[PDB]
């Protein structure tokens, strides 16, 4: 039982780390979509 | 026009003469509907020539130069410019817009400014954009009689509207923000 549990835990935590990396990558490119959103709001101000 | 009148033998080079030639340009030049036919008529008949009285009392006769001058608007090659004519400039500008609005732009092509006060320019532009544009587009030039002042009249209209009074830069906003405020107000 405990060997399967160890394998599951290692697999799970490696996947968790990888998806935290992916999640933080998404957060950073959202922290650039922030600048794009400001630029797009300025274009919307031109249109207003 | 100074160039082609000098080639005609009426040499014009001084800063004062340039204004006499501008007066000739304003009074006697026109946009012909067909450049080749107009040239043929001018070469086969003198009915296209007009008399102009210079300030010293000398009378000079202006011929095909009346329409060869403004033709440079449509064929900049006469000036040595490798550029679009006004018809092509308008047509390509429309064709850089989204397809859905090109029909409205074709139907509302407006000529404005002092250089547009020639006779025949509206007809020539209409013909050119009908020949260039798709047959499906309902082309229409609009060329008002006061089009030399339309630039200013638009500002009169704009600035006198009650709802426009929110659009100004105020002295307070300039003091708060500096000149960059213009990028937040004026377009």
Swiss-Prot record, chain A:
Subcellular location: Nucleus
Organism domain of life: Eukaryota
Chain ranges of the HSA domain: 1-48
Disease: Floating-Harbor syndrome: A rare genetic disorder characterized by proportionate short stature, delayed bone age, delayed speech development, and typical facial features. The face is triangular with deep-set eyes, long eyelashes, bulbous nose, wide columella, short philtrum, and thin lips.
Functional summary from the UniProt entry: Catalytic component of the SRCAP complex which mediates the ATP-dependent exchange of histone H2AZ/H2B dimers for nucleosomal H2A/H2B, leading to transcriptional regulation of selected genes by chromatin remodeling. Acts as a coactivator for CREB-mediated transcription, steroid receptor-mediated transcription, and Notch-mediated transcription.
Protein family membership: Belongs to the SNF2/RAD54 helicase family. SWR1 subfamily.
Subunit note: Interacts with CREBBP and EP300. May be part of a complex containing SRCAP, CREBBP, CARM1 and GRIP1. Component of the chromatin-remodeling SRCAP complex composed of at least SRCAP, DMAP1, RUVBL1, RUVBL2, ACTL6A, YEATS4, VPS72, ACTR6 and ZNHIT1. Component of a NuA4-related complex which contains EP400, TRRAP/PAF400, SRCAP, BRD8/SMAP, EPC1, DMAP1/DNMAP1, RUVBL1/TIP49, RUVBL2, actin, ACTL6A/BAF53A, VPS72 and YEATS4/GAS41.
Protein name listed in UniProt: Helicase SRCAP
Underlying gene: SRCAP
Residues of the full protein shown: 146 to 193 of 3230
Swiss-Prot record, chain B:
Record text on subunit structure and interactions: Polymerization of globular actin (G-actin) leads to a structural filament (F-actin) in the form of a two-stranded helix. Each actin can bind to 4 others. Identified in a IGF2BP1-dependent mRNP granule complex containing untranslated mRNAs. Component of the BAF complex, which includes at least actin (ACTB), ARID1A, ARID1B/BAF250, SMARCA2, SMARCA4/BRG1, ACTL6A/BAF53, ACTL6B/BAF53B, SMARCE1/BAF57 SMARCC1/BAF155, SMARCC2/BAF170, SMARCB1/SNF5/INI1, and one or more of SMARCD1/BAF60A, SMARCD2/BAF60B, or SMARCD3/BAF60C. In muscle cells, the BAF complex also contains DPF3.
Disease: Dystonia-deafness syndrome 1: An autosomal dominant form of dystonia with juvenile onset, associated with congenital or childhood-onset sensorineural deafness. Dystonia is defined by the presence of sustained involuntary muscle contraction, often leading to abnormal postures. Some DDS1 patients have dysmorphic features, skeletal anomalies, and/or mild developmental delay with impaired intellectual development.
Domain of life: Eukaryota
The name this protein goes by in its record: Actin, cytoplasmic 1
Miscellaneous comment: In vertebrates 3 main groups of actin isoforms, alpha, beta and gamma have been identified. The alpha actins are found in muscle tissues and are a major constituent of the contractile apparatus. The beta and gamma actins coexist in most cell types as components of the cytoskeleton and as mediators of internal cell motility.
Whole sequence portion shown: 189 to 375 of 375
Gene: ACTB
Cross-link ((Microbial infection) Isoglutamyl lysine isopeptide (Glu-Lys) (interchain with K-50)): 82
Effect of residue 176 to K: In THC8; uncertain significance; results in reduced actin polymerization rate without affecting depolymerization; has no effect on ATP hydrolysis rate; does not affect thermal stability
Subcellular localization: Cytoplasm, Cytoskeleton; Nucleus
Biological role stated in the UniProt entry: Actin is a highly conserved protein that polymerizes to produce filaments that form cross-linked networks in the cytoplasm of cells. Actin exists in both monomeric (G-actin) and polymeric (F-actin) forms, both forms playing key functions, such as cell motility and contraction. In addition to their role in the cytoplasmic cytoskeleton, G- and F-actin also localize in the nucleus, and regulate gene transcription and motility and repair of damaged DNA.
Family, per entry: Belongs to the actin family.
């Amino acid at each position: 039982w405990l060997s399967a549990d160890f394998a599951q835990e290692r697999r799970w935590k490696r996947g968790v780390a990888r998806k935290v990396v992916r999640m933080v990558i998404r957060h950073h490119e959202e922290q650039r979509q922030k600048e794009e959103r400001a630029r797009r709001e300025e274009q919307a101000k031109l249109r207003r | 026009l100074m160039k082609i009148l000098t080639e005609r033998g009426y040499s014009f080079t001084t800063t004062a003469e340039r204004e006499i030639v501008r007066d000739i340009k304003e009074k006697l030049c026109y946009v012909a509907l067909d450049f080749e036919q107009e040239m043929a008529t001018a070469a086969s008949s003198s009915s296209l020539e007009k008399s102009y009285e210079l300030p010293d009392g000398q009378v000079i006769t202006i011929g095909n130069e009346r329409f060869r001058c403004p033709e440079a608007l449509f064929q900049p090659s006469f000036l040595g410019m490798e550029s679009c004519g006004i018809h092509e400039t308008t047509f390509n500008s429309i064709m850089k817009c989204d397809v859905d609005i090109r029909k409205d732009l074709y139907a509302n092509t407006v000529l404005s400014g002092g250089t547009t006060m020639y006779p025949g320019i509206a007809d020539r532009m209409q013909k050119e954009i009908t020949a260039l544009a798709p047959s499906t587009m309902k082309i229409k030039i609009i060329a008002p009689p006061e089009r030399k002042y339309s630039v200013w009249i638009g500002g009169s209209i704009l600035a006198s509207l009650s709802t426009f009074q929110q659009m100004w830069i105020s002295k307070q906003e300039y003091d708060e923000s500096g000149p960059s405020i213009v990028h937040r107000k004026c377009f």
